[PDB]
């Protein structure tokens, strides 16, 4: 299976719609709207 982690990169904030991560806090919100206005057309992320 997927066995290979090249480099390390974690994130404090994360999207609860698609999983998109964002360094800042507010930033995420600016992206979250993408779901508040338009629908992803179903569960994009498991
Ligand atoms: Zn998202």
User: How far does residue 9's CA lie from ligand 1's centre (Å)?
Assistant: 18
Task: Select from 24, 2, 6 the least CA-distant residue to 15.
Answer: 24
Q: Which residues contact 42 (CB under 8 A, 6 or more apart)?
A: none
Phi, psi (degrees; rounded to nearest 5) at 45? -105, 125
User: How far does residue 32's CA lie from ligand 1's centre (Å)?
Assistant: 5
Q: Domain segments of the chain: what residues? A: 11-46
Class for the domain spanning 11-46: alpha beta
The structure was resolved experimentally with NMR
User: How far does residue 40's CA lie from ligand 1's centre (Å)?
Assistant: 9
Q: Which residues contact 18 (CB under 8 A, 6 or more apart)?
A: 35, 40, 44, 45
Cα separation of 17 and 38, whole Å?
12
Cα separation of 13 and 27, whole Å?
9
User: How far does residue 35's CA lie from ligand 1's centre (Å)?
Assistant: 7
Which protein residues have a CB closer than 5 Å to ligand 1 (ion)? 15, 17-18, 20
10-44 residues labelled b (16+ CB within 10 A) or e (exposed)? eeeeebebeebebeeeeebeeeeeeeeeeeeeeee
């Amino acid at each position: 299976g997927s066995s290979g982690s090249s480099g390390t990169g974690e994130k404090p904030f994360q999207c609860k719609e698609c999983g998109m991560n964002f360094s800042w806090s507010c930033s995420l919100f600016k992206h979250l709207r993408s779901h508040e206005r338009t629908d992803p057309s179903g569960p994009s992320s498991g």
